[PDB]
């Protein structure tokens, strides 16, 4: 990881929170190409000091994204570990995370938009699967909208997958249960069951989000009822726009070895 000096970073407005993290828009002063000086808009992700003990995992989550280069994976610029701070410096995405975008724009998002976004996310996940690299936290909150759809120029939206954050293999059990139904049942049973098939299940949950205008599946159930939801082997209800419902349920298969490869997922999306 490239080291960035605290003096080169300016913190601006809070953009949100993650698990034990706070997110800010910022500016990085840097020497760029041809030696030209730039002030670049950056994403500053700060691990809470009270949870400094997660630092390794916090940074490892980003390292996974930095080992491979792909048009659908967020760019990591570096880290700032000056003083008592653990700061991840990433690219700033203009339109924010996909969950909020779906909630705010669900009245003007049609099936073609959801299909294109789904194809792009499946392409990112197929890239990861080919490299046998587990993400571990696929969800709408970890998808960023680089570009909006422009039907005037026939231009589709463009998304990137962001880093998973602190791994579910070290997170407290109550948080994992709160993350049902993104965390697959085998990982609720044993978080060390984290595998490539995890990402297929969570991909299904994320498709449900994309089809549900920003709603959170099972949000009305508390942790105990989410657990029992897995115990009784329920599936999510079909979204009102149910064009992808069968794909969602096929990905959210309680048998991990039966979850389809992302190549088959992509073939299914292209058939629709
Ligand atoms: O990783 C995240 N966000 C980002 C990573 N890279 N860039 C971002 C990001 N970029 C963001 C930009 C906005 C500004 N809004 C955008 C949509 O239109 C209204 C204003 C808000 C939040 C944003 N988050 N998680 C989101 C904060 C909870």
UniProtKB/Swiss-Prot annotation:
The record marks 174-175 as: Breakpoint for translocation to form PCM1-JAK2 fusion protein. Ubiquitously expressed throughout most tissues. The modification Phosphotyrosine is found at residue 34. It is found in: Endomembrane system; Cytoplasm; Nucleus. Autophosphorylated, leading to regulate its activity. Also phosphorylated by TEC. Phosphorylated on tyrosine residues in response to interferon gamma signaling. Phosphorylated on tyrosine residues in response to a signaling cascade that is activated by increased cellular retinol. Possesses 2 protein kinase domains. The second one probably contains the catalytic domain, while the presence of slight differences suggest a different role for protein kinase 1. Non-receptor tyrosine kinase involved in various processes such as cell growth, development, differentiation or histone modifications. Mediates essential signaling events in both innate and adaptive immunity. In the cytoplasm, plays a pivotal role in signal transduction via its association with type I receptors such as growth hormone (GHR), prolactin (PRLR), leptin (LEPR), erythropoietin (EPOR), thrombopoietin receptor (MPL/TPOR); or type II receptors including IFN-alpha, IFN-beta, IFN-gamma and multiple interleukins. Belongs to the protein kinase superfamily. Tyr protein kinase family. JAK subfamily. This is Tyrosine-protein kinase JAK2. The chain holds residues 537 to 808 of 1132 of the full protein.
